[PDB]
Write a protein that binds this ligand. Structure first.
Ligand SMILES: Nc1ncnc2c1ncn2[C@@H]1O[C@H](COP(=O)(O)OP(=O)(O)O)[C@@H](O)[C@H]1O
Ligand SMILES: Nc1ncnc2c1ncn2[C@@H]1O[C@H](COP(=O)(O)OP(=O)(O)O)[C@@H](O)[C@H]1O
Lengths: 235, 235
């Protein structure tokens, strides 16, 4: 019956915003390597939503080249007049973004070739801007160890988040107006299982839509009815 | 009138034989980087002349590839039936030289590409043998720094010889039967100028052929007559 919150600031969100603003204002490269289902994509989306001079793209294996990634960057910077070449595209990206004190955000940096990430680091080094990587722990694990070693000298900042926190899901429950202590422990048990923010928000929206359709309050019984579903331990 | 010595053991020769036998019996890679005119080529030739299970090739820019270098190696190992391919040539070189406890000697390793020296180090690592490099100081200076870094872990031994020694030219003068103290100082002055063994042996053979043609002994005057030639300080 109250509003379902689309987002809440957490301890992990306040950490990743600190590292984000650090990589931007420092104008240096930071890696966010950690297991997904923790919210780094939506946190970076929230940062780009709240703050200007911030740019965030995604990288697919269908867009794993240098040219496709720079085309994504040209679409993100607001330039539909991107040349199909690699050279003058790169120099136009260098022209547009110089002096902006901007921030480039890279999601799924584990799908990168060495030439692609090398062109991105030489780009940001020739632009005096900040670069932020996302993905699993393989993003850092592809570097330990000699081809990204100068990049390992440029990579100074990383905040690695494997699993969530107690105050993390506590602030989430505060956003969703949850005060049951057994409910708190059950949400922590949800946070124990992987895909934590995903499975958590699934269970929360199931319980919320159930409590609105039945006209009631989300209780621990609606949490068991939601979390008992989704077939997580089914092989 | 006595015999002109083709070779003498020196302190530098005893050092480079120690490093040579070390790289061979250790079955690991050693670098000899230093300015030429010091005798490393003739010392390695002397080592191969005195000792069995020892192989020494040269590398030209006309033979700077992997295939040409392995063809040189196949000629050096006594196999005229070398295939023109790169694969079965390399495996035949691996077959012939395994269990031999041999020594490969490389002259002018400064002309090497990374693929060539990488194939040589993977060869010797797949053969359990010793590899010895020669050349100027650029041989080590091409590594400081990430592509030969694992090779920098395999390169443990190096003896760098820039200039000669006092006992060096003293033993040379003892081979050439020289007992003048001013003659000793003048030979040291020859050793000060670069191309030391080359210019030294040039001056020695000029003085020796002069003393045989005039029927006399090599004196300090024949040393001035030889060393005053060769036009070293002429631009
Ligand atoms: N503050 C928040 N409150 C609730 N859910 C969040 C919050 N931030 C992120 N999420 C959740 O994170 C999920 C996506 O992030 P995630 O899959 O962890 O990204 P990545 O796959 O890059 O690690 C979304 O389903 C979203 O519900
Ligand atoms: N023991 C020795 N006595 C006299 N001369 C020597 C001796 N060893 C080497 N040399 C001289 O070294 C010269 C060639 O070696 P060098 O040019 O220094 O090889 P590199 O060019 O590989 O450094 C020859 O001219 C030879 O006269």
């Amino acid at each position: 019956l109250p509003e379902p919150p689309r987002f809440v600031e957490t301890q992990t969100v306040k950490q990743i915003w600190t590292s984000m603003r650090f990589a931007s204002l420092t104008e240096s490269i930071a890696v966010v390597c950690g297991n997904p289902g923790v919210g780094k994509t939506e946190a970076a989306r929230e940062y780009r939503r709240t703050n200007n001079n911030v740019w965030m793209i995604t990288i697919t294996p269908s867009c794993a080249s240098v040219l496709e990634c720079l085309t994504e960057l040209a679409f993100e910077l607001g330039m539909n007049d991107a040349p199909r070449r690699k050279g003058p595209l790169s120099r136009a990206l260098r022209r547009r973004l110089e002096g902006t004190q901007g921030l480039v955000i890279i999601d799924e940096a584990d799908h990168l070739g060495a030439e692609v990430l090398e062109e991105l680091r030489l780009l940001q080094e020739s632009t005096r801007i900040g670069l932020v990587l996302m993905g699993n722990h393989r993003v850092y694990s592809n570097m330990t160890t000699v081809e990204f070693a100068r990049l390992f000298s440029r990579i100074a900042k990383r905040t690695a988040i494997n699993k969530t926190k107690k105050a993390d899901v506590k602030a989430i429950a505060d956003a969703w107006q949850i005060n049951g202590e057994k409910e708190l422990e059950l949400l922590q048990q949800i946070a124990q299982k992987p895909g934590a923010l995903r499975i958590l928000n699934h269970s929360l929206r199931l319980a919320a839509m159930t409590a609105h359709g039945k006209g009631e309050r989300v209780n621990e019984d609606y949490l068991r009815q939601a979390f008992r579903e989704l077939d997580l331990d089914v092989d």
